[PDB]
Amino acid sequence: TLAATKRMEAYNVVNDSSDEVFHFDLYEWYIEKGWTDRILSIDSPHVITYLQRLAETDFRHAELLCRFYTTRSRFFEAAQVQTNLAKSDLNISLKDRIILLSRAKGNASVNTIGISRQQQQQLNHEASELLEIAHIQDDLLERLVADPRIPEERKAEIEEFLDGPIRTLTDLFNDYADQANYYDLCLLIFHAADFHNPRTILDTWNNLINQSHFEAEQRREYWPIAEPPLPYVYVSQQIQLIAHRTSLDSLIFPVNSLLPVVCAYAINNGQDASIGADPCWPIQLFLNLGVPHALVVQVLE
């Protein structure tokens, strides 16, 4: 149409101009009108400077710059901003930083034209690490706040410290996870920290099993809204939760030692046919978790 011609004639004057102070005032006005998809389509290089200079102090503008790159398929450049934004000093909630690192991990998982394979994985590894930590920090804060053992005065002091940037595993372990005797989250920290120590890893597994057995036996004794599960069932849940979440690392999930422990617990605490349980529930647990048959039989031997 000639209507469509006068449209293209008009937006060529605008997009081609060399006055970038005009472009900035134009991009600022496009947002105020909610014309989001318009900013993205612009191929001028004055838009990149505007969005980059605004991403530095506005989370919701760094959002578009990341959208700008991902519609153009510059996936690495987006994860590069999403990661550098989660590590920022900006006022961003922890659960948003979990999204950022989760998107960054995806955008840095696929090849992007021009950028190396090493720099692609160099960023995916960094983002994945932080996401694992941030998930611990989130699951930790969630449990600390709901912990009756903690004073309501301290809970506010924690929430301000945790609900924001991602802290070191050292800070998460000492001043919080280990004190509260959160044995399951202590193991996730060992895994996320590549913590080399066979004993303490095993000692923590023993405490995690016992504390789990207790919470389930107290429940069964009380029944408590629905019929609670028998002890080994809740213990089995707390291992599966680690197994999927650990991705079955040999350091914090050593079948060489842990399987005897679970089999020992199944005897010393009488989780067997007496209570209607499958006597081979320790074997059934590890096999279905992905442990090789050739190894399980090697341990029972």
């Binding site: 903690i150 301290r154 000492n174 001043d175 919080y176």
Partner: peptide
């Protein structure tokens, strides 16, 4: 990088100041 230090912490079960 993890460093356990049971020595000096902050009592998780006591308010501040």
């Amino acid at each position: 990088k993890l460093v356990i230090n049971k020595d000096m912490r902050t009592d998780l079960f006591s308010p501040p100041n």
